[PDB]
């Protein structure tokens, strides 16, 4: 599995690169949402 590299004009295909193995991680919306709820608390200001 590969991907194409497009030039900045948007039309030509000027190469290809092999898809990195990070893109095969299991997609987990429950875990992402739960981690996001805890992390977004760290930038609050006190009152």
């Amino acid at each position: 599995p590969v991907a194409n590299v497009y030039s900045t004009n948007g039309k030509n295909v000027v190469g290809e690169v092999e898809i990195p193995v990070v893109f095969q991680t299991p997609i987990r919306n429950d875990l992402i949402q739960s981690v996001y709820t805890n992390m977004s608390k760290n930038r609050r200001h006190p009152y």
Partner: protein
């Protein structure tokens, strides 16, 4: 190998930018996505879950014909400009080889309904 149609259905059942439910008149729920011939929120009619699909839509003033037919992740979105009944019939033979008859009369009836809509300027 980390994804399939069933897993895509699992991730998009509830959270989705095309779902619409009516708070008043409690019956009903719709998917308005581009490749949904009906508007049912089911895995067997949603364009995001299916691997091959056809549809007819307005999308701007006129009527537009759409095909998906992507079988090796080659997600191709072909858009054609429907003009009249004969042209739509020709396009169904050209690109809709994967449809049953039952779906084809439904799409033709939908097109016959869509052709009666117009506005000013």
């Amino acid at each position: 190998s980390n994804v399939s149609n069933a897993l895509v259905w699992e991730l998009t059942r509830k959270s989705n930018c095309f779902i619409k439910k009516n708070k008043a008149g409690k019956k009903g729920v719709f998917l308005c996505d581009p490749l949904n011939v009906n508007y049912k929120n089911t895995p067997s009619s949603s364009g995001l879950v299916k691997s091959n699909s056809t549809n007819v839509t307005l999308k701007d003033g006129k009527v537009v014909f759409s095909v998906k037919t992507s079988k090796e992740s080659n997600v191709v979105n072909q858009h054609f400009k429907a003009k009249n009944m004969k042209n739509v019939e020709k396009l169904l033979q050209q690109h809709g080889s994967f449809e049953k008859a039952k779906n084809k009369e439904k799409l033709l009836k939908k097109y016959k309904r869509l052709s009666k809509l117009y506005e000013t300027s």
